[PDB]
């Protein structure tokens, strides 16, 4: 246990770091798009209230960004610290994209800094749109390049194993692996979405309370519609990635959906409770999706989990996360699909609290679904790294350091999150 506790403690710590990282990240990915769009709408419509919401957002986008950065640095450093023997092999292949993430971030950060410090000096709004286009591009460029890491971690290749030593590396084979499309796509969509609901959860808070229809109805009207779109696309690329899994790595998917048994028409599950050792309690399940319109043939035989080695299978507490993520997906898409529809273009239900409440919950629900989703996709992963890559159990280092540094970091992040939330509310209550 002087070199086996860390197998667990490291996992735990890394979760605690990155779990914090993402709160301050998918915002970094989705917000800038939304800002660009707000600017563009303000410009195209000659309505200098959207142009105020662009900056009104940016002014906190900064603080989000910075907290993102420090947690980023944290995880970045923690990477090869907690998992040396991993990077000993794969570092050669991961090195580039990881760099390209932060490079793309600096590239966006320049223009972000320009707009931030030229919108109050130099001329014309288009010339500030042209400064906000590169930003969101660089943001999504981060996600692209960094996700390509996880996509790769999930799947080879671009390498060869000389008795353990990883060589003969092709950049774009490892980068543009089979998972990369669905990861990049689903991550970008479910990050435009999230922030799209997050701004709606401001507009629905401020409009609900001190009903300054002014910005706050326009804000909702836009954010909600875009949120709808992004949730739709998100769900689509969700089905896509699900199919990818069913085809390429059913170990996750069969654990998500508890398909111990291989079958043609295999039902999905809405929620259940199988405690790790076969204890089927709540059982609410529907016939199969990812075959009828995915594979175009309902009787496409889904690989079962029994057919996966029990040293190669991940937990069964994955299902709950699929439940969470998906159901939040659908519910939130429905709320979004109604708002603009029923509450604006039909029976004027906007001013009703029955919406504003749900729309206040909206963003938080999405971020939740994010954490959940990441847990799902990442925790279906633990028992593969130990094989085609290298033993997870032989990836960590020492114990009596990690246990404490974990708690230090825990405290630190606790402070970060709280403080950031506080300041980031204070600003909005100051009304700049």
């Amino acid at each position: 246990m002087n070199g086996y506790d860390p197998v667990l403690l490291s996992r735990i710590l890394t979760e605690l770091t990155l779990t914090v990282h993402i709160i301050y990240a998918t915002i970094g990915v989705g917000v800038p798009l939304m800002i660009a769009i707000a600017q563009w709408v303000g410009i195209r419509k000659n309505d200098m209230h959207y142009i105020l919401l662009a900056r009104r957002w940016t002014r906190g986008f900064v603080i989000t960004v910075a907290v993102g950065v420090v947690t980023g640095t944290a995880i970045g450093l923690q990477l090869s610290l907690l998992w040396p023997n991993f990077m000993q092999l794969a570092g050669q292949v991961i090195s580039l994209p990881l760099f390209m993430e932060t490079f793309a971030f600096f590239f966006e950060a320049i223009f972000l800094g320009i707009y931030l410090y030229t919108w109050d000096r130099f001329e014309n709004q288009k010339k500030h749109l042209l400064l906000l286009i590169p930003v969101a591009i660089g943001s999504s460029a981060s996600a692209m390049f960094i996700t390509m890491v996880n996509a790769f971690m999930n799947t080879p290749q671009g390498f060869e194993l000389k008795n353990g030593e990883l060589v003969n590396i092709d950049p774009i084979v490892a980068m543009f692996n089979p998972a990369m499309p669905t990861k990049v796509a689903h991550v970008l969509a479910t990050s435009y979405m999230t922030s799209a609901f997050v701004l709606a959860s401001i507009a629905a808070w401020h409009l609900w309370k001190g009903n300054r229809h002014i910005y706050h109805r326009k804000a909702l009207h836009l954010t909600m519609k875009t949120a709808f779109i992004f949730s739709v696309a998100s769900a689509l690329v969700g089905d896509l990635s699900g199919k990818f899994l069913a085809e390429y790595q059913p170990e996750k998917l069969a654990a998500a959906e508890w398909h111990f048994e291989t079958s043609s028409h295999a039902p999905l599950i809405l929620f259940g409770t199988l405690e790790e050792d076969n204890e089927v309690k709540y059982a609410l399940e529907i016939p199969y999706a990812l075959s009828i319109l995915a594979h175009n043939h309902p009787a496409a035989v889904v690989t079962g989990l029994n057919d996966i080695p029990e040293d190669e299978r991940p937990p069964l507490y994955i299902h709950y996360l699929f439940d969470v993520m998906v159901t939040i997906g659908v519910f939130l898409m429905v709320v979004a699909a109604v708002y603009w529809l029923g509450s604006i273009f039909r029976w004027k239900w906007t001013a009703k609290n029955w919406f504003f409440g749900l729309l206040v919950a909206g963003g938080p629900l999405a971020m939740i679904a994010i954490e959940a989703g990441w847990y799902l996709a990442e925790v279906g992963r633990q028992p593969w790294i130990l094989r085609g890559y290298m033993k997870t159990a032989e990836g960590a280092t020492t114990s009596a350091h990690v246990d404490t540094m974990l708690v230090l970091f825990c405290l630190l992040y606790i402070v970060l999150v709280i403080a950031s939330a506080t300041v980031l509310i204070r600003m909005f209550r100051r009304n700049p």
């Binding site: 798009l33 769009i37 563009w40 709408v41 195209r44 419509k45 089979p178 499309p181 669905t182 990049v184 796509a185 689903h186 970008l188 969509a189 435009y192 799209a196 009207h221 836009l222 519609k225 875009t226 779109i229 992004f230 739709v232 696309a233 998100s234 689509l236 690329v237 896509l240 990635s241 199919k243 990818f244 603009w340 604006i344 273009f345």
Partner: peptide, 30 residues
């Protein structure tokens, strides 16, 4: 090939749809 490419497409579509909202039912409506 089609289902390997498709996602990013779906995304790219969702983006410029999300823009198109700003012209359709934002500029010339509500």
């Amino acid at each position: 090939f089609l289902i390997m490419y498709a996602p990013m497409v779906v995304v790219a579509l969702s983006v410029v749809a999300a823009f198109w909202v700003g012209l359709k039912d934002v500029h010339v409506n509500e």
